């Protein structure tokens, strides 16, 4: 057969769930926002920020949650950042027309409501936003120096914020015209310079496998020929496994030595196409470690595989799962090359590259738990300045525009309506709901903390917001706390959108039967 | 009553009166052992000698009464 | 998934002890009953059991604190003998004792330190009962005597105690200077005789002389080898393949007969009739062997060897690649003699000392297994009496002299500590408890009037409990080894404090 | 779906923190009760260490499985003291709900709880200096290691062992910056000896082979044949045909394979190391053949048994019998034998004066049981020792320095007396749990044990004058030796206040159904 049920006791179920979903979304991102911890299938355990990261994750019990997947997969795909507050806005459109509906008020006249409203906020948004680029320095550097300090001071540090800015900054412009996150990716030990962080402009590598000889081979180049190979290198290699034999004398010697003339044949078919590095994915055995520092050859296995993406795309090179090359575009080549333990791990790093774009940091904190925040941090202000980049029309931070533009609307609320009062109110109630569980996941009163921001919106100014690291009013301009004004009206767009889903459709259709 | 570690007290104070240590017992305002043959503690010879002979008395009559009949 | 709290796990520790303990405290002492297994969980059978290790072993216990008492236990009856029995009834007495001091709420590290300070105070005290009564040669004869008579005792035996009492005591003395733990050998056969136990001038191997084989064999010179044979001897680079069919399944069982001919000539070239090999044979390979005039017996052993090493002045050796590496042997007379209901073949020669062999004569199987342990148990102590001359006063006697000094010291030396220093000799006194209804005596007339007796005078006079009265436990014989005693105390002491440590029992 | 909203999620963050917190508590010190544990095979196990049971035990909870990977870093980095943490920051926990439930919000805590984490690693700048010179601090590391050998394992102090244990970090700290690492030290043990018996070895070792008394047994000069190439005969677990044509080609096949023999001989020694090991093994017959052509040979070797004696000597291994030079061969300080237990066999000692690369104390045992008990009192010893080697900053904790940062965060939030001030008094009562749990697994009453150092806080700050829990009656940390490493206790303070950061991470307790399901 096939489910199916219509109308307002439908559409009430299906109001009701969208908001219970929602509740992980409402109440996250930040330093004084959340992080994430769930338990999916067998027991693994992972933790997270973005909602779009864990929504793709958690499974989808109505078609309320299938509503959500995509529209937090468009905010995660363009920014990264903020990628649960499209989910939040959507459900707390929801709340306040759930009386009016209940009571029987439900006009399809809700979602154009919903697109009015958002022409008005999305003008306003860019109409009060200013490009920092261009009007608030010429070489805008030094610009985004102090967006990224104040990025490193929201989350954990306090006093590596001016050793680490310049550092993220010099890394950012690197890589414009890119947004990987395998290419600005951050290395941990503990035991270098403890509480400083370096930026290389190259490859450098986490694990690098060891303890079978490095020492007998030259840990440096000034021309590598990098294999970036992902082929088991055995301790021997074999013979057959059926009639295969020892004792007799004549065919004795031979077939213990033939195990290991056939490893070395295809060891110097890694040798003679082209490498004087060789770096695998699958384990390098350990006496054909010792063979390397025959033809004194640098060499690691037990490789991660996003290490060996870093090398391909800034030597142009490309990874291999084979035992013989034919061109050097797709082998890796640099111009130095220099291993360098850190913290009593092996790094090989990778300078002098033929682009040099992938750009890593060997960070050094303190501990290691102290490093993981460290590294979220940094990470932090890898992307915000990055967004900043790409778009020099920029806000203020903290939903600091939501709480003017809630009281923007309203009097519109009071201009327009035949009925439009309730919605557009509903709307601007849902905009002050964002700084509100900005004040709420920091955990303190936001009818304290809002309404005096409002006092100070009535005179004028609309980057007035919270400085969340003391949790006190502040203009989020003037306090730095920035993001780009497009991001919101990319949020706007999607978040009016699927509450336009929601009011259109009042009835599921299951047509397998579940 | 002093409210203290009983099992303490009273192996500590077994341990005094073992070799005989008899003129110090148990001040209870701290619990410690204290001074005796006059403290403030020290009680009466005609108290004791009176209650040892009650209480010794009426448990074994208690022992006696095995064969009790309600008929009330 | 399953953590299982402090509140359960200790008292998962004390009924894991006071079942195990009741099993065997009515064999414990001079066992006026005993403790009967019931086989039902393997097969349909009754076992009598006055063997601690047929009850800890042979009925696995499933409470994880038990384990670790049945555990220790088991190495004190390996070296020492009788230790399954002894150390498990006190470590399962003190934790009744420990659960009044949780139920006045002591400190469980108090317990742990209040056991072990009176088992240090109860040790001295078993020491300064220990004396000497191997001093003299007739001394030392009377010593091991009436040692022998109480360590077969609290066992279940018709006829067999007074005949191995004064068979062992004579190995023993015969030394003089140690004991006979290292060639004397334990030889367990089907005799008529339910008191018969008697020791070899010479030794022994099992050799039914059959088919046409001589008798006796006389001025011996014995080629000791290792290489043998069952059935099967192989050509040495070559072979027989005979299946392609369902006939040749008879006839491959018909071609071991010829198999047993090839390993015949190679004994021939010797000459030597003398020859003994670690492999047996059967009626088939024996009328093969004597046709030659070179015999083969069977049965060997290293311990053959070894017992004709020490008397006779040679060495037992192995590996029989060439003969020279294997330490031959030399007899006088191989004679088979008749020992029980089985036929054996005897090298007999010179013998008494170092090394012996004992045989031992019953025809029901339960009867000779008994035997084997109760032999075991006392000839490590009657060499412990070689190493410490020192005896105690058996019975319980001595219990009573480490309960009366500890309860002393338990008074005088804590201050919060004599709580669980008296639960220390409290559980010393549940030891005549345990006995005196074995006798049928009030054990509450035992337990506190013979303590007080015995220590104020004439410490001899003890537990005479084959008669439910009061005897002399040096008059009456009654006395054992200081060394056995000493021993049963530690292992009965910390495997209770290990099982008390335990306040977090968790299953995975 | 059933949410579990605020306190209700935080008496769910109760049941399992207030159950391995308490499990904890009777655990602390050498008065610490063992923890046992029934495997899920159903295997006795008695340890008295979390980081064991908390890796052995099947956790159930949010909580529980947090706490694998918390006591993994405390083990790996400092240690002993992986009670310690999860008896303290329970503690804070279940003080938090009364904080929660004082109306006190749970995040403004957790704010506070990291900066009463901070003023706490201020006092120890100021607590329990920090120099120790190389030769006198191996002394109270002796004394150190005598409190875990002496109590835990083994009643009376093997001296032999934790003389040896700090003597073989100083073996690999000088090559490396003052440094120890984990995988350049290895604690070495095999019973079948003596439990007294124990030694340092700077390289690997392997039984070594003789096949009979009357060959010679030799041992030689400081090089060794680190070879996986055949100087004997080697099998790899396999089988051939055998066939000659005449008994006599066999007689001249044994006067064939001696020459043979010496020409294996001749080619090895003529490149030095006179010590050949081969990897793949040989019976005992061309064995004592070449033990009677002089040269010995130690067959049937492990697999990476190879690897290690080629880091130790820091040369390469040679892989074919064609192949022959020095540099594949190893290159030892000292290559003398000594025999394995006492009763068994013999070893092959190589040590090496050039790499420390393995350098491995080896253990003996009379017992099987004992020595992994005993490993663990050296697992714990080797890891409290690499904190010293870098700096030499210790601590006289167990009693001391918990009153005196009680004493400070308390002081704290009313000198620094703003909102944090009841997470600082959370934090502050908290450490008072742990000199508790010292006491409270022990006999003495915790509850006047509190007391005392107190006052002698009154008397002096910076207390080297702490609790006792050996019961001697002499309270102290310096007379009583009860010392430990300054970097030790900084990170107990840090993961502690991790724990409670990690419970606060995000505001979702909803599932559907399935978050820990």
Same mark, same amino acid.
């Given at each position: 057969?096939?489910?199916?049920?219509?109308?307002?006791?439908?559409?009430?179920?299906?109001?009701?769930?969208?908001?219970?979903?929602?509740?992980?979304?409402?109440?996250?991102?930040?330093?004084?926002?959340?992080?994430?911890?769930?338990?999916?299938?067998?027991?693994?355990?992972?933790?997270?920020?973005?909602?779009?990261?864990?929504?793709?994750?958690?499974?989808?019990?109505?078609?309320?949650?299938?509503?959500?997947?995509?529209?937090?997969?468009?905010?995660?795909?363009?920014?990264?950042?903020?990628?649960?507050?499209?989910?939040?806005?959507?459900?707390?459109?929801?709340?306040?027309?759930?009386?009016?509906?209940?009571?029987?008020?439900?006009?399809?006249?809700?979602?154009?409501?919903?697109?009015?409203? @958002?022409?008005?906020?999305?003008?306003?948004?860019?109409?009060?936003?200013?490009?920092?680029?261009?009007?608030?320095?010429?070489?805008?550097?030094?610009?985004?120096?102090?967006?990224?300090?104040?990025?490193?001071?929201?989350?954990?540090?306090?006093?590596?914020?001016?050793?680490?800015?310049?550092?993220?900054?010099?890394?950012?412009? $690197?890589?414009?015209?890119?947004?990987?996150?395998?290419?600005?990716?951050?290395?941990?030990?503990?035991?270098?310079?403890?509480?400083?962080?370096?930026?290389? &402009?190259?490859?450098?590598?986490?694990?690098?496998?060891?303890?079978?000889?490095?020492?007998?081979?030259?840990?440096?180049?000034?021309?590598?020929?990098?294999?970036?190979?992902?082929?088991?290198?055995?301790?021997?290699?074999?013979?057959?496994?059926?009639?295969?034999?020892?004792?007799?004398?004549?065919?004795?010697?031979?077939?213990?030595? &033939?195990?290991?003339?056939?490893?070395?044949?295809?060891?110097?078919?890694?040798?003679?196409?082209?490498?004087?590095?060789?770096?695998?994915?699958?384990?390098?055995?350990?006496?054909?470690?010792?063979?390397?520092?025959?033809?004194?050859?640098?060499?690691?296995?037990?490789?991660?595989?996003?290490?060996?993406?870093?090398?391909? $795309?800034?030597?142009?090179?490309?990874?291999?799962?084979?035992?013989?090359?034919?061109?050097?575009?797709?082998?890796?080549?640099?111009?130095?090359?220099?291993?360098?333990?850190?913290?009593?791990?092996?790094?090989?790093?990778?300078?002098?590259?033929?682009?040099?774009?992938?750009?890593?940091?060997?960070?050094?904190?303190?501990?290691?738990?102290?490093?993981?925040?460290?590294?979220?941090?940094?990470?932090?202000?890898?992307?915000?300045?990055?967004?900043?980049?790409?778009?020099?029309?920029?806000?203020?931070?903290?939903?600091?525009?939501?709480?003017?533009?809630?009281?923007?609307?309203?009097?519109?609320?009071?201009?327009?309506?035949?009925?439009?009062?309730?919605?557009?109110?509903?709307?601007?109630?849902?905009?002050?709901?964002?700084?509100?569980?900005?004040?709420?996941?920091?955990?303190?009163?936001?009818?304290?903390?809002?309404?005096?921001?409002?006092?100070?919106?009535?005179?004028?100014? @609309?980057?007035?917001?919270?400085?969340?690291?003391?949790?006190?009013? &502040?203009?989020?301009?003037?306090?730095?706390?920035?993001?780009?004004?497009?991001?919101?009206?990319?949020?706007? @767009?999607?978040?009016?959108?699927?509450?336009?889903?929601?009011?259109?459709?009042?009835?599921?259709?299951?047509?397998?039967?579940? | 009553?002093?409210?203290?570690?009983?099992?303490?007290?009273?192996?500590?104070?077994?341990?005094?009166?073992?070799?005989?240590?008899?003129?110090?017992?148990?001040?209870?305002?701290?619990?410690?052992?204290?001074?005796?043959?006059?403290?403030?503690?020290?009680?009466?010879?005609?108290?004791?000698?009176?209650?040892?002979?009650?209480?010794?008395?009426?448990?074994?009559?208690?022992?006696?009464?095995?064969?009790?009949?309600?008929?009330? | 998934?399953?953590?299982?709290?402090?509140?359960?796990?200790?008292?998962?520790?004390?009924?894991?002890?006071?079942?195990?303990?009741?099993?065997?405290?009515?064999?414990?002492?001079?066992?006026?009953?005993?403790?009967?297994?019931?086989?039902?969980?393997?097969?349909?059978?009754?076992?009598?059991?006055?063997?601690?290790?047929? #009850?800890?072993?042979?009925?696995?216990? %499933?409470?994880?604190?038990?384990?670790?008492?049945?555990?220790?236990?088991?190495?004190?009856?390996?070296?020492?003998?009788?230790?399954?029995?002894?150390?498990?009834?006190?470590?399962?007495?003190?934790?009744?004792?420990?659960?009044?001091?949780?139920?006045?709420?002591?400190?469980?590290?108090?317990? #742990?330190?209040?056991?072990?300070?009176?088992?240090?105070?109860?040790?001295?005290?078993?020491?300064?009962?220990?004396?000497?009564?191997?001093?003299?040669?007739?001394?030392?004869?009377?010593?091991?005597?009436?040692? =022998?008579?109480?360590?077969?005792? /609290?066992?279940?035996?018709?006829?067999?105690?007074?005949?191995?009492?004064?068979?062992?005591?004579?190995?023993?003395?015969?030394?003089?200077? /140690?004991?006979?733990?290292?060639?004397?050998?334990?030889?367990?056969?089907?005799?008529?005789?339910?008191?018969?136990?008697?020791?070899?001038?010479?030794?022994?191997?099992?050799?039914?002389?059959?088919?046409?084989?001589?008798?006796?064999?006389?001025?011996?010179?014995?080629?000791? =080898?290792?290489?043998?044979?069952?059935?099967?001897?192989?050509?040495?680079?070559?072979?027989?393949?005979?299946?392609?069919?369902?006939?040749?399944?008879?006839?491959?069982?018909?071609?071991?007969?010829?198999?047993?001919?090839?390993?015949?000539?190679?004994?021939?070239?010797?000459?030597?009739?003398?020859?003994?090999?670690?492999?047996?044979?059967?009626?088939?390979?024996?009328?093969?062997?004597?046709?030659?005039?070179?015999?083969?017996?069977?049965?060997?052993?290293?311990?053959?060897?070894?017992?004709?090493?020490?008397?006779?002045?040679?060495?037992?050796?192995?590996?029989?690649?060439?003969?020279?590496?294997?330490?031959?042997? /030399?007899?006088?007379?191989?004679?088979?003699?008749?020992?029980?209901?089985?036929?054996?073949?005897?090298?007999?020669?010179?013998?008494?000392?170092?090394?012996?062999?004992?045989?031992?004569?019953?025809?029901?199987?339960?009867?000779? %297994?008994?035997?084997?342990?109760?032999?075991?148990?006392?000839?490590?102590?009657?060499?412990?009496?070689?190493?410490?001359?020192?005896?105690?006063?058996?019975?319980?006697?001595?219990?009573?002299?480490?309960?009366?000094?500890?309860?002393?010291?338990?008074?005088?030396?804590?201050?919060?500590?004599?709580?669980?220093?008296?639960?220390?000799?409290?559980?010393?006194?549940?030891?005549?408890? #345990? #006995?005196? %209804?074995?006798?049928?005596?009030?054990?509450?007339?035992?337990?506190?009037?013979?303590?007080?007796?015995?220590?104020?005078?004439?410490?001899?006079?003890?537990? %005479?409990?084959?008669?439910?009265?009061?005897?002399?436990?040096?008059?009456?014989?009654?006395?054992?080894?200081?060394?056995?005693?000493?021993?049963?105390?530690?292992?009965?002491?910390?495997?209770?404090?290990?099982?008390?440590?335990?306040?977090?029992?968790?299953?995975? | 779906?059933?949410?579990?909203?605020?306190?209700?999620?935080?008496?769910?963050?109760?049941?399992?923190?207030?159950?391995?917190?308490?499990?904890?508590?009777?655990?602390?010190?050498?008065?610490?009760?063992?923890?046992?544990?029934?495997?899920?095979?159903?295997?006795?196990?008695?340890?008295?260490?979390?980081?064991?049971?908390?890796?052995?035990?099947?956790?159930?909870?949010?909580?529980?499985?947090?706490?694998?990977?918390?006591?993994?870093?405390?083990?790996?980095?400092?240690?002993?003291?992986?009670?310690?943490?999860?008896?303290?920051?329970?503690?804070?926990?279940?003080?938090?709900?009364?904080?929660?439930?004082?109306?006190?919000?749970?995040?403004?805590?957790?704010?506070? !709880?990291?900066?009463?984490?901070?003023?706490?690693?201020?006092?120890?700048?100021?607590?329990?200096?920090?120099?120790?010179?190389?030769?006198?601090?191996?002394?109270?590391?002796?004394?150190?290691?005598?409190?875990?050998?002496?109590?835990?394992?083994?009643?009376?102090?093997?001296?032999?062992?934790?003389?040896?244990?700090?003597?073989?970090?100083?073996?690999?700290?000088?090559?490396?910056?003052?440094?120890?690492?984990?995988?350049?030290?290895?604690?070495?043990?095999?019973?079948?000896?003596?439990?007294?018996?124990?030694?340092?070895?700077?390289?690997?070792?392997?039984?070594?082979?003789?096949?009979?008394?009357?060959?010679?047994?030799?041992?030689?000069?400081?090089?060794?044949?680190?070879?996986?190439?055949?100087?004997?005969?080697?099998?790899?677990?396999?089988?051939?045909?055998?066939?000659?044509?005449?008994?006599?080609?066999?007689?001249?096949?044994?006067? !064939?394979?001696?020459?043979?023999?010496?020409?294996?001989?001749?080619?090895?020694?003529?490149?030095?190391?006179?010590?050949?090991?081969?990897?793949?093994?040989?019976?005992?017959?061309? +064995?004592?053949?070449?033990?009677?052509?002089?040269?010995?040979?130690?067959?049937?070797?492990?697999?990476?048994?190879?690897?290690?004696?080629?880091?130790?000597?820091?040369?390469?291994?040679?892989?074919?019998?064609?192949?022959?030079?020095?540099?594949?061969?190893?290159?030892?300080?000292?290559?003398?034998?000594?025999?394995?237990?006492?009763?068994?066999?013999?070893?092959?000692?190589?040590?090496?004066?050039? +790499?420390?690369?393995?350098?491995?104390?080896?253990?003996?045992?009379?017992?099987?049981?004992?020595?992994?008990?005993?490993?663990?009192?050296?697992?714990?010893?080797?890891?409290?020792?690499?904190?010293?080697?870098?700096?030499?900053?210790?601590?006289?904790?167990?009693?001391?320095?918990?009153?005196?940062?009680?004493?400070?965060?308390?002081?704290?939030?009313?000198?620094?007396?703003?909102?944090?001030?009841?997470?600082?008094?959370?934090?502050?009562?908290?450490?008072?749990?742990?000199?508790?749990?010292?006491?409270?697994?022990?006999?003495?009453?915790?509850?006047?044990?509190?007391?005392?150092?107190?006052?002698?806080?009154?008397?002096?700050?910076?207390?080297?004058?702490?609790?006792?829990?050996?019961?001697?009656?002499?309270?102290?940390?310096?007379?009583?030796?009860?010392?430990?490493?300054?970097?030790?206790?900084?990170?107990?303070?840090?993961?502690?206040?991790?724990?409670?950061?990690?419970?606060?991470?995000?505001?979702?307790?909803?599932?559907?159904?399935?978050?820990?399901?």
């Amino acid at each position: 057969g096939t489910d199916s049920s219509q109308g307002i006791p439908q559409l009430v179920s299906n109001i009701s769930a969208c908001q219970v979903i929602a509740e992980a979304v409402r109440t996250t991102l930040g330093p004084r926002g959340m992080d994430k911890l769930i338990v999916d299938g067998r027991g693994k355990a992972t933790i997270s920020n973005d909602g779009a990261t864990i929504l793709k994750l958690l499974d989808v019990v109505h078609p309320a949650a299938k509503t959500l997947v995509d529209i937090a997969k468009s905010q995660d795909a363009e920014v990264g950042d903020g990628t649960t507050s499209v989910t939040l806005l959507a459900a707390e459109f929801l709340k306040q027309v759930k009386p009016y509906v209940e009571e029987g008020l439900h006009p399809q006249i809700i979602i154009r409501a919903f697109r009015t409203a @958002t022409q008005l906020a999305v003008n306003k948004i860019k109409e009060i936003a200013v490009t920092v680029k261009k009007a608030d320095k010429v070489e805008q550097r030094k610009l985004l120096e102090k967006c990224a300090m104040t990025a490193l001071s929201s989350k954990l540090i306090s006093q590596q914020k001016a050793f680490f800015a310049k550092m993220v900054v010099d890394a950012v412009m $690197m890589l414009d015209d890119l947004l990987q996150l395998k290419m600005i990716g951050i290395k941990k030990v503990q035991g270098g310079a403890l509480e400083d962080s370096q930026l290389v &402009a190259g490859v450098a590598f986490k694990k690098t496998f060891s303890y079978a000889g490095f020492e007998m081979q030259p840990k440096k180049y000034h021309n590598p020929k990098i294999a970036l190979l992902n082929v088991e290198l055995e301790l021997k290699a074999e013979k057959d496994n059926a009639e295969i034999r020892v004792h007799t004398v004549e065919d004795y010697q031979a077939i213990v030595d &033939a195990e290991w003339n056939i490893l070395y044949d295809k060891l110097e078919k890694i040798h003679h196409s082209g490498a004087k590095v060789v770096l695998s994915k699958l384990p390098i055995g350990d006496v054909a470690t010792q063979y390397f520092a025959d033809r004194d050859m640098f060499c690691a296995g037990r490789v991660p595989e996003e290490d060996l993406k870093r090398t391909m $795309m800034a030597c142009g090179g490309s990874i291999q799962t084979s035992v013989n090359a034919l061109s050097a575009d797709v082998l890796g080549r640099c111009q130095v090359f220099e291993e360098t333990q850190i913290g009593g791990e092996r790094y090989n790093f990778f300078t002098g590259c033929p682009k040099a774009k992938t750009c890593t940091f060997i960070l050094r904190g303190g501990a290691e738990q102290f490093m993981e925040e460290t590294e979220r941090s940094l990470h932090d202000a890898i992307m915000i300045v990055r967004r900043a980049i790409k778009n020099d029309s920029v806000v203020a931070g903290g939903g600091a525009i939501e709480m003017e533009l809630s009281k923007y609307l309203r009097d519109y609320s009071r201009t327009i309506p035949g009925k439009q009062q309730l919605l557009i109110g509903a709307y601007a109630k849902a905009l002050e709901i964002i700084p509100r569980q900005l004040c709420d996941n920091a955990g303190f009163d936001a009818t304290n903390i809002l309404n005096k921001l409002r006092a100070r919106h009535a005179q004028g100014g @609309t980057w007035y917001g919270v400085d969340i690291n003391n949790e006190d009013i &502040a203009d989020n301009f003037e306090a730095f706390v920035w993001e780009p004004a497009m991001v919101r009206i990319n949020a706007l @767009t999607a978040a009016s959108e699927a509450a336009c889903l929601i009011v259109s459709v009042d009835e599921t259709i299951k047509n397998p039967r579940s | 009553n002093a409210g203290y570690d009983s099992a303490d007290l009273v192996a500590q104070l077994r341990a005094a009166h073992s070799e005989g240590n008899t003129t110090a017992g148990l001040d209870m305002r701290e619990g410690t052992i204290g001074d005796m043959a006059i403290l403030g503690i020290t009680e009466s010879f005609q108290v004791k000698r009176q209650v040892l002979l009650s209480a010794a008395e009426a448990a074994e009559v208690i022992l006696r009464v095995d064969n009790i009949i309600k008929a009330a | 998934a399953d953590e299982e709290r402090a509140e359960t796990a200790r008292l998962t520790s004390f009924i894991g002890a006071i079942a195990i303990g009741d099993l065997v405290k009515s064999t414990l002492g001079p066992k006026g009953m005993d403790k009967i297994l019931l086989s039902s969980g393997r097969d349909a059978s009754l076992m009598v059991t006055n063997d601690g290790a047929t #009850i800890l072993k042979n009925i696995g216990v %499933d409470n994880p604190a038990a384990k670790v008492l049945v555990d220790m236990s088991r190495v004190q009856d390996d070296e020492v003998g009788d230790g399954t029995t002894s150390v498990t009834v006190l470590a399962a007495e003190l934790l009744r004792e420990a659960e009044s001091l949780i139920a006045k709420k002591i400190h469980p590290q108090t317990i #742990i330190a209040g056991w072990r300070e009176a088992t240090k105070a109860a040790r001295e005290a078993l020491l300064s009962s220990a004396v000497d009564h191997g001093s003299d040669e007739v001394k030392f004869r009377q010593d091991l005597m009436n040692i =022998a008579g109480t360590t077969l005792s /609290s066992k279940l035996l018709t006829h067999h105690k007074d005949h191995f009492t004064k068979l062992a005591v004579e190995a023993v003395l015969r030394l003089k200077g /140690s004991g006979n733990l290292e060639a004397i050998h334990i030889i367990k056969k089907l005799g008529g005789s339910l008191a018969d136990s008697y020791l070899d001038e010479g030794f022994l191997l099992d050799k039914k002389i059959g088919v046409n084989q001589p008798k006796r064999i006389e001025n011996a010179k014995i080629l000791i =080898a290792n290489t043998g044979m069952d059935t099967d001897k192989i050509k040495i680079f070559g072979s027989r393949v005979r299946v392609d069919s369902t006939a040749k399944v008879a006839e491959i069982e018909h071609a071991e007969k010829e198999k047993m001919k090839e390993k015949v000539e190679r004994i021939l070239k010797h000459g030597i009739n003398c020859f003994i090999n670690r492999q047996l044979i059967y009626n088939y390979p024996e009328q093969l062997f004597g046709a030659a005039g070179v015999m083969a017996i069977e049965h060997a052993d290293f311990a053959g060897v070894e017992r004709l090493a020490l008397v006779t002045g040679g060495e037992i050796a192995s590996t029989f690649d060439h003969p020279e590496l294997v330490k031959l042997g /030399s007899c006088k007379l191989i004679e088979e003699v008749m020992i029980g209901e089985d036929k054996l073949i005897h090298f007999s020669g010179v013998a008494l000392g170092e090394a012996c062999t004992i045989v031992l004569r019953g025809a029901t199987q339960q009867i000779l %297994d008994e035997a084997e342990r109760s032999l075991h148990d006392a000839l490590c102590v009657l060499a412990q009496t070689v190493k410490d001359s020192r005896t105690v006063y058996g019975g319980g006697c001595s219990e009573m002299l480490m309960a009366h000094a500890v309860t002393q010291l338990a008074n005088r030396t804590p201050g919060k500590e004599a709580v669980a220093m008296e639960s220390y000799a409290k559980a010393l006194r549940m030891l005549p408890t #345990i #006995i005196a %209804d074995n006798a049928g005596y009030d054990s509450a007339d035992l337990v506190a009037q013979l303590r007080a007796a015995h220590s104020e005078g004439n410490t001899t006079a003890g537990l %005479d409990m084959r008669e439910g009265t009061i005897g002399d436990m040096a008059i009456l014989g009654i006395t054992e080894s200081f060394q056995v005693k000493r021993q049963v105390l530690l292992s009965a002491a910390e495997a209770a404090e290990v099982i008390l440590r335990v306040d977090n029992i968790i299953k995975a | 779906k059933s949410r579990l909203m605020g306190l209700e999620a935080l008496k769910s963050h109760i049941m399992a923190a207030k159950a391995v917190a308490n499990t904890m508590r009777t655990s602390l010190g050498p008065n610490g009760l063992d923890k046992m544990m029934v495997d899920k095979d159903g295997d006795v196990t008695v340890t008295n260490d979390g980081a064991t049971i908390l890796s052995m035990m099947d956790v159930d909870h949010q909580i529980a499985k947090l706490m694998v990977e918390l006591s993994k870093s405390q083990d790996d980095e400092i240690g002993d003291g992986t009670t310690g943490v999860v008896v303290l920051a329970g503690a804070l926990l279940e003080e938090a709900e009364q904080l929660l439930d004082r109306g006190i919000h749970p995040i403004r805590i957790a704010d506070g !709880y990291e900066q009463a984490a901070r003023v706490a690693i201020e006092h120890l700048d100021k607590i329990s200096d920090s120099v120790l010179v190389d030769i006198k601090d191996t002394e109270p590391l002796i004394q150190t290691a005598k409190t875990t050998l002496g109590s835990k394992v083994v009643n009376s102090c093997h001296r032999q062992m934790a003389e040896i244990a700090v003597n073989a970090v100083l073996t690999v700290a000088d090559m490396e910056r003052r440094d120890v690492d984990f995988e350049l030290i290895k604690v070495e043990g095999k019973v079948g000896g003596r439990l007294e018996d124990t030694k340092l070895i700077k390289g690997v070792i392997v039984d070594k082979d003789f096949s009979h008394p009357q060959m010679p047994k030799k041992v030689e000069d400081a090089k060794i044949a680190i070879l996986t190439c055949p100087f004997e005969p080697p099998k790899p677990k396999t089988k051939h045909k055998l066939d000659v044509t005449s008994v006599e080609d066999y007689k001249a096949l044994q006067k !064939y394979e001696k020459e043979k023999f010496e020409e294996m001989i001749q080619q090895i020694k003529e490149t030095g190391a006179n010590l050949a090991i081969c990897q793949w093994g040989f019976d005992d017959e061309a +064995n004592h053949l070449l033990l009677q052509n002089n040269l010995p040979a130690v067959r049937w070797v492990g697999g990476p048994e190879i690897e290690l004696i080629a880091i130790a000597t820091g040369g390469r291994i040679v892989p074919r019998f064609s192949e022959l030079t020095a540099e594949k061969l190893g290159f030892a300080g000292l290559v003398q034998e000594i025999s394995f237990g006492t009763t068994k066999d013999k070893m092959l000692v190589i040590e090496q004066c050039k +790499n420390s690369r393995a350098v491995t104390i080896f253990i003996r045992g009379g017992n099987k049981m004992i020595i992994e008990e005993a490993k663990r009192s050296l697992h714990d010893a080797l890891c409290v020792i690499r904190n010293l080697i870098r700096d030499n900053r210790v601590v006289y904790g167990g009693g001391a320095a918990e009153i005196s940062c009680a004493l400070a965060v308390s002081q704290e939030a009313d000198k620094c007396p703003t909102l944090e001030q009841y997470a600082m008094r959370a934090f502050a009562d908290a450490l008072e749990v742990i000199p508790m749990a010292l006491s409270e697994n022990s006999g003495m009453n915790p509850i006047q044990t509190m007391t005392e150092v107190r006052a002698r806080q009154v008397k002096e700050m910076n207390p080297a004058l702490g609790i006792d829990c050996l019961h001697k009656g002499t309270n102290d940390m310096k007379q009583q030796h009860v010392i430990e490493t300054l970097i030790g206790k900084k990170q107990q303070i840090s993961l502690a206040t991790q724990m409670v950061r990690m419970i606060l991470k995000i505001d979702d307790i909803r599932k559907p159904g399935e978050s820990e399901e």
